[PDB]
Amino acid sequence: VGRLIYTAGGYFRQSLSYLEAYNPSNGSWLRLADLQVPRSGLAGCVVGGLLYAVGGRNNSPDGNTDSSALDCYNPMTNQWSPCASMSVPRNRIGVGVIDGHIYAVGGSHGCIHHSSVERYEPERDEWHLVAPMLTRRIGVGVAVLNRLLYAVGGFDGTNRLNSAECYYPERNEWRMITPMNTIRSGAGVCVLHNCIYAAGGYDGQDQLNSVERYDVETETWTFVAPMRHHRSALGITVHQGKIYVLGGYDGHTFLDSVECYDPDSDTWSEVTRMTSGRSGVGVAVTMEPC
Ligand SMILES: O=C(O)C[C@H](c1ccc2c(c1)OCCO2)c1ccc2ccc(OCC(=O)NC3CCCCC3)cc2c1
Incomplete structure (x- = not known):
């Protein structure tokens, strides 16, 4: 009990510093401590009850700066603290956690599209590089299942990808x-x-509402029910057996919609709206702030 969906940063006209947290149990939203630096194209994750914001880019009227930053938010204090920075800036990054370690995957730095991957150790506050991917990938989706790390899709600098x-x-x-x-x-x-x-x-042509899932045992991808809205650069997380998708861009509007997927019924429902439309957010789940 007592866990919230946190959304950090994002993009609407420029990169955003917002940290807002949604309570699925009562529908409430809370505005929490701003990020020190506005960022879009970052990823969020949680280790040991702390929320981490990784990478991204600060798009502002006065510049575009890709981020190598790792910042941690403690809900007990409502404060952000800097952590050790990554070896390189990584915009449009993907992140996964294995056994208390954060993996930062891919992303861009200017015109560079990374294949490199690095792993953070919170106990030592240190990053080290690991083996790079077989493909350069920005806008890459990352998830962890059974202590294996998956990198899905993205853009390699020339082509958008269906590979994983x-x-x-x-x-x-x-x-x-x-x-x-x-x-x-x-x-x-x-x-x-x-x-x-x-x-x-x-x-490469349109924003998608389709959704597909990879069964790691059968090695097949299968489509499930599509979302109500086409969305790219959406936030995503899982909470109590359901997928939540937050915001994104539908080709016309920066969405404030949040939809929830129920795997038992194979249906999507609209559950709430963010306080403003935005894309490129980082999302993760942890305890409510004190
Ligand atoms: O395929 C590609 O070139 C890369 C891809 C991409 C690029 C251009 C696009 C597009 C998708 O769809 C709409 C048509 O223009 C991508 C993928 C992931 C992103 C994650 C975060 C993020 O943060 C900052 C952010 O939201 N900016 C938005 C600007 C306004 C709409 C697109 C992104 C950006 C990401 C961008």
């Missing part, structure tokens, strides 16, 4: 997996039960 790959930590090795049925950059990627889900994104 899996990292095996004990061998420090990446292997390709079955590609998705759809090309997707800027999808929301998460894990629910035994599947990796890829929701929305941009196929």
Whole structure:
């Protein structure tokens, strides 16, 4: 009990510093401490009850600065603190957590599209590089299932991708997996039960409402019910057995919609609206602030 969906940063006209938290139990939103630096294209994750904001870019009227930053938010204090920075700036990053370590995957730095991957150790406040992916990927979806790390889709600098790959930590090795049925950059990627889900994104032509899921045992991708809204650069998380998608861009509007997927019924429902439309947010779940 007492867990909230946190949304950090984002983009609307410029990169945003907002930290807002939604309570699925009562529908309430709270505005919390702003990020020290506005960022879009970042990822959020939680280790040990602390919320981490990783990477991104500060788009402002006075510049565009890709971020190598790792910042941690403590809900007990409602304060952000800087952590050790990554080896490189990574905009449109993907992040996953394995056994208390944060993996930062891909992303861009100017015209560079990274294949590099690095791993954060909160106990030592240190980053170290690990094996790079087989493909350069920005706007990559990342999720962790059964202590394996998946990198899904993205953009390699020339083509948007339907390919995906899996990292095996004990061998420090990446292997390709079955590609998705759809090309997707800027999808929301998460894990629910035994599947990796890829929701929305941009196929090079249109923003997508389709959603597909990879069963790690059968190695197949299967479509599920589509979202109500086409969305790229959406936020995504899982909470109490349901997927939540937040915001994004539908080709016309920066969305304030939040939709919830129920796997038992294979349906999406609109559950709330953010306080303003935005894309490129980082999202994660942790305890409510004190
Ligand atoms: O395919 C690609 O080139 C990369 C891809 C991408 C680029 C251009 C697009 C697009 C998708 O769809 C709409 C058409 O223009 C991508 C993917 C993930 C992102 C994640 C965060 C993020 O943060 C900052 C952010 O929201 N900016 C938005 C500006 C207004 C709409 C697009 C993103 C950006 C991401 C961008």
